[PDB]
Design a protein around this ligand. Structure first.
Ligand SMILES: *[C@@H]1O[C@H](CO)[C@@H](O[C@@H]2O[C@H](CO)[C@@H](O[C@@H]3O[C@H](CO)[C@@H](O)[C@H](O[C@H]4O[C@H](CO)[C@@H](O)[C@H](O)[C@@H]4O)[C@@H]3O)[C@H](O)[C@H]2NC(C)=O)[C@H](O)[C@H]1NC(C)=O
Ligand SMILES: *[C@@H]1O[C@H](CO)[C@@H](O[C@@H]2O[C@H](CO)[C@@H](O[C@@H]3O[C@H](CO)[C@@H](O)[C@H](O[C@H]4O[C@H](CO)[C@@H](O)[C@H](O)[C@@H]4O)[C@@H]3O)[C@H](O)[C@H]2NC(C)=O)[C@H](O)[C@H]1NC(C)=O
Ligand SMILES: *[C@@H]1O[C@H](CO)[C@@H](O[C@@H]2O[C@H](CO)[C@@H](O)[C@H](O)[C@H]2NC(C)=O)[C@H](O)[C@H]1NC(C)=O
Ligand SMILES: *[C@@H]1O[C@H](CO)[C@@H](O[C@@H]2O[C@H](CO)[C@@H](O)[C@H](O)[C@H]2NC(C)=O)[C@H](O)[C@H]1NC(C)=O
Ligand SMILES: *[C@@H]1O[C@H](CO)[C@@H](O[C@@H]2O[C@H](CO)[C@@H](O)[C@H](O)[C@H]2NC(C)=O)[C@H](O)[C@H]1NC(C)=O
Ligand SMILES: *[C@@H]1O[C@H](CO)[C@@H](O)[C@H](O)[C@H]1NC(C)=O
Ligand SMILES: CN(C)C[C@H]1N[C@H](CO)[C@H](O)[C@@H]1O
Ligand SMILES: CN(C)C[C@H]1N[C@H](CO)[C@H](O)[C@@H]1O
Lengths: 392, 392
């Protein structure tokens, strides 16, 4: 999408995985979808360093709407859970220096059954713009035809443009095409800043493996379409929640950097371990994800329950990730000729290698003929940055 | 098995899950199966508080043997990796106040292909006794018939008894019978101190869930046979390794206590986090596992992706575990009438309830009319101890 936005993958926070559609503010007040939750989350995004690390979009997912539109046909926030309205919430979010994301659906209903935007694309786009919305996640439930799906996504893109406000446009379009036909990513990219290709993540290592395996299996079809203004979306970061070991968290962080993924945390910033915080705020790994070249990485090799992925970076540098998919035993040794990495360019005539994950450690100069040896934890990843150099 | 041993579930350390069959002492000297590895573990079992917590059996699994028997038909330890021999290693372990466990196979080969004990049951039992062995894990690979399987397990049990040395006898018998015939656990218990029912654990939450689900599915067959001298073995504790989140580690510790499981850690005592160590050394949770009554707990209910397990304890006390199997979202509320717990006697007329996991906190007095409400983390467990007020 040529709107000048998402020149690097968008970073922020999104409530869905951790909080879902909890509407019971009487018995579960700390986890129900309410304006107070998003206000407190904005406060912590500022005070706990999230904004400084680059996370700037505070995003509402489904279940923010009143059950029906108002008399003038406009969407309204739920009067009990969002009594002060989206415009006031957006003013608060902007006052903290953040941007506000919201959720809508291309069909007749959102996935949770709240008012859909079909037949209201223009008025809904203008409503969000008047409210101060800066990002829209546009879902695909309750759409009765591929033609309606495509027309709705294109129309909402055009309507948002017609508002004149810069709004990041996140599409679920390709995923909902799946039961019927293969996506045309040139078109999708023309209309969308990000697009989701695969099923929802949850709080499990199984879901991480599934997203990674689907991505690598389909990488010939999706990797090259990504770039500044248009990204593949492998869904939210779930670091900081309950189902991932430390090494599995490292794997998600490293591979979302390799994949040039949008980085939308879905966790509770009020209750997050210092380790998870340090990983999610890792400056060097974020810098990899945010590399200005904007070329998505890919799986280079797989076999013997190992995977090697790499991503070309600006200025002849490369990121390299090594995953140990064997879920038994201890750290496993893996060796590779550095000439096999980065298309043979990374370490020609030499490269300086810095391990970034699981811990940061300079490994030194590797000449083009040398071999790199590492040990990778079960379900963990070793992430390295290779810097091309003629010295040593 | 009425040999006076395992009056409470045996506790110790076993190398298999973490270290497997690593024979490469040239490239991996600190992780290969060697006399030095077991000496280091013994030293740390003493110095890092494991023995004080109750972990007393330091156990060798497969891949300790020389490729062939000696001239006199006896098993020998690998001359390069165990240069001083098992008897000497056992002397060292005993000098630390610990006990030594070893591994053999009922069939013609061990699962890793080393000498099996078929045709050598008596000589192998006497060899182990002469060496000072205190525990035998007896595997089931390379056995060509159910009759040979049963005959071998019984024969080895009798041979161990005839040596006159007290040796804990751990059998894989039921597991290797199951695909063909249902085990008679009265008989198995007559011959074995522990028996494995289900497939090997590995370093994953998936393996934990499978073991728990098989246990609850089969609990009518296996729960009542367990007791002092004879336990169901759901395989090793894998806390402290790489594949489990904190809440999944809590679930394994809590449910191995509920199940009156032998507690055999398989980890690296040289590299273990303070969190994992404090959980594995949890005095109150170990006390539940080691309760002298020795009545195995059971699954009381399941539904809405929740499980409630309970275990009767000595002196009118009960342990209760609540598991959240929903792997998305946040801590989920679960409520139950305390009159439904402990067969209706735990809290009649009242009980004092203490949460032990994930953190210890006294919850207070609960009357027979009361309801207990808890929030349980996804893939985590809340473990409670209930003390009837007539014992207070
Ligand atoms: C509505 O849609 C239209 C397109 O249909 C869109 O207009 C486009 O806006 C982008 C971003 O402002 C324009 O791209 C710029 O083009 C000018 C031409 O000289 C350049 O100066 C810009 O370069 C800078 O910014 C780039 C980032 O986009 C950097 O890569 C670059 O290094 C410079 O820093 C930039 O290329 C594009 O020309 C127009 N296209 C048109 C007018 O046809 C408009 O923004 C949309 N409006 C809303 C509200 O979404
Ligand atoms: C070989 O097999 C035989 C036959 O099964 C086996 O003999 C058994 O040994 C155990 C313990 O050595 C005996 O259990 C004892 O039973 C008597 C009752 O007659 C009790 O008084 C004993 O009390 C112990 O427990 C007390 C707490 O209750 C403790 O204060 C203290 O530790 C006491 O020692 C104990 O329960 C069992 O009776 C015999 N059975 C027979 C038939 O003799 C023998 O141990 C096996 N040998 C080897 C080397 O495995
Ligand atoms: C939302 O529902 C309306 C009404 O059910 C859909 O409009 C119908 O669309 C079908 C085929 O698309 C036509 O055959 C009907 O004649 C339409 N009925 C009316 C009253 O317009 C509409 O397509 C639905 N929107 C989406 C996105 O699925
Ligand atoms: C996929 O959709 C794209 C976007 O419309 C198609 O490529 C464009 O086609 C239009 C229509 O002829 C041209 O005006 C553009 O110049 C094309 N753009 C590019 C970048 O090629 C493309 O043909 C479609 N592919 C398939 C297989 O349907
Ligand atoms: C399961 O095994 C037990 C022990 O071998 C059997 O119990 C014995 O049954 C015999 C009858 O053949 C009785 O004389 C004994 O008193 C029982 N106990 C002991 C300790 O021997 C039981 O019958 C077996 N059940 C099945 C279905 O095979
Ligand atoms: C071991 O091998 C011999 C020779 O093939 C065979 O007769 C015997 O039954 C085998 N034992 C077991 C337990 O499989
Ligand atoms: C795009 N997937 C398939 C479903 C989406 N619907 C939910 C809101 O109801 C979440 O946004 C979830 O991402
Ligand atoms: C009982 N299971 C099915 C196989 C066993 N063989 C391995 C040693 O080679 C481990 O002891 C593992 O527990």
């Amino acid at each position: 999408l040529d709107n000048g936005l998402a020149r690097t993958p968008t970073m922020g926070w999104l409530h869905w995985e951790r909080f879902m559609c909890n509407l019971d503010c009487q018995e579960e007040p700390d986890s129900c979808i309410s304006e107070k939750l998003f206000m407190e989350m904005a406060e912590l995004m500022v005070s706990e360093g999230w904004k400084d690390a680059g996370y700037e979009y505070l995003c509402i997912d489904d279940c923010w709407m009143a059950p029906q539109r108002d008399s003038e046909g406009r969407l309204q926030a739920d009067p009990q859970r969002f009594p002060h309205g989206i415009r006031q919430l957006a003013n608060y979010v902007h006052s903290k220096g953040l941007k506000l994301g919201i959720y809508a659906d291309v069909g007749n209903k959102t996935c949770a059954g709240f008012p859909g935007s079909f037949g209201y694309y223009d008025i809904d786009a203008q409503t969000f713009a008047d409210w101060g919305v800066d990002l829209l996640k546009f879902d695909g439930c309750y759409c009765d035809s591929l033609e309606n799906l495509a027309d709705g996504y294109k129309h909402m893109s055009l309507a948002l443009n017609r508002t004149g406000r810069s709004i990041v446009y996140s599409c679920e379009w390709p995923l909902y095409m799946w039961p019927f036909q293969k996506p045309n990513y040139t078109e999708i990219r023309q209309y969308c800043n990000h697009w989701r290709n695969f099923a929802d993540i949850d709080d499990s290592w199984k879901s991480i493996k599934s997203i990674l395996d689907w991505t690598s299996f389909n990488q010939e079809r999706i990797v090259d379409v990504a770039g500044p203004g248009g990204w593949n979306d492998p869904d939210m970061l779930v670091i900081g929640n309950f189902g991932l070991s430390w090494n599995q968290q490292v794997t998600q962080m490293a591979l979302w950097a390799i994949m040039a993924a949008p980085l939308f945390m879905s966790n509770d910033l009020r209750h997050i371990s210092p380790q998870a915080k340090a990983l999610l705020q890792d400056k060097d790994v974020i810098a990899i994800n945010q590399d200005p070249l904007g070329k998505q990485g890919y799986q280079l090799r797989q076999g013997d329950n190992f995977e090697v992925w790499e991503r070309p970076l600006s200025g002849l540098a490369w990121a390299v990730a090594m995953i140990n998919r064997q879920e038994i035993g201890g750290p496993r040794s893996y060796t590779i000729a550095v000439a096999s990495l980065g298309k043979g360019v990374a370490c020609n005539p030499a490269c300086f290698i810095t391990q970034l994950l699981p811990v940061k450690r300079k490994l030194g100069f590797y000449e083009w003929t040398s071999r790199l040896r590492s040990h990778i934890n079960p379900t963990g990843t070793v992430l390295l940055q290779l810097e091309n150099t003629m010295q040593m």
